[PDB]
Amino acid sequence: RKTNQLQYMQNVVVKTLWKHQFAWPFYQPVDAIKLNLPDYHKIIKNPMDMGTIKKRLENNYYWSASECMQDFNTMFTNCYIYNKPTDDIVLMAQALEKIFLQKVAQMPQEE
Ligand code: NA
């Protein structure tokens, strides 16, 4: 069984964010080819997405919740690194990130 905090990341944080109307671009790794970057992987050194995070939770990958939180931070920050302030995807990420912060502020204690 995962830590209680990792269960929270799965059953509250991911579950809530996944259902948000703006979450879908984050469901899978950014495919530079389907969208030839051609430069994406030249700037984005550590790609991350919520599909990967969800799989890691399901597959028991994380040792502690901090690692999962870091993956979310990487996902959001990467979006901002690559995109302009006025881009639709940035507004989408911002909405999701505000929810992420509100939910991780309520993360439970391990007992
Ligand atoms: Na934990």
Residue numbers in the entry: 34 to 144
Q: What are the paper's exact sentences on this?
A:
Bromodomains (BRDs) are protein interaction modules that specifically recognize ε-N-lysine acetylation motifs, a key event in the reading process of epigenetic marks. The four helices form a deep cavity that is extended by the two loop regions (ZA and BC loops), creating a largely hydrophobic Kac binding pocket.
The insertions at x3 are present in the N-terminal domain of BET family members. Our SPOT array and ITC data showed that multiple Kac sites are generally required for specific recognition of the histone H4 tail by all human BET family members. Binding of di-Kac marks separated by three residue spacers as found in sequences linking the H4 K8/K16 and K16/K20 required a glycine or a hydrophobic residue in the first linker position for optimal binding to the first BET BRDs. For instance, recurrent t(15;19) chromosomal translocations that result in a fusion protein that comprises both BRD4 or BRD3 and the NUT (nuclear protein in testis) lead to an aggressive form of human squamous carcinoma (French, 2010a; French et al., 2001). The recent development of potent and highly specific Kac competitive inhibitors for BET BRDs provides a compelling case for targeting these BRDs for the treatment of an extremely aggressive subtype of squamous cell carcinoma that is caused by chromosomal rearrangement of BRD3 or BRD4 with NUT (Filippakopoulos et al., 2010; French, 2010b).
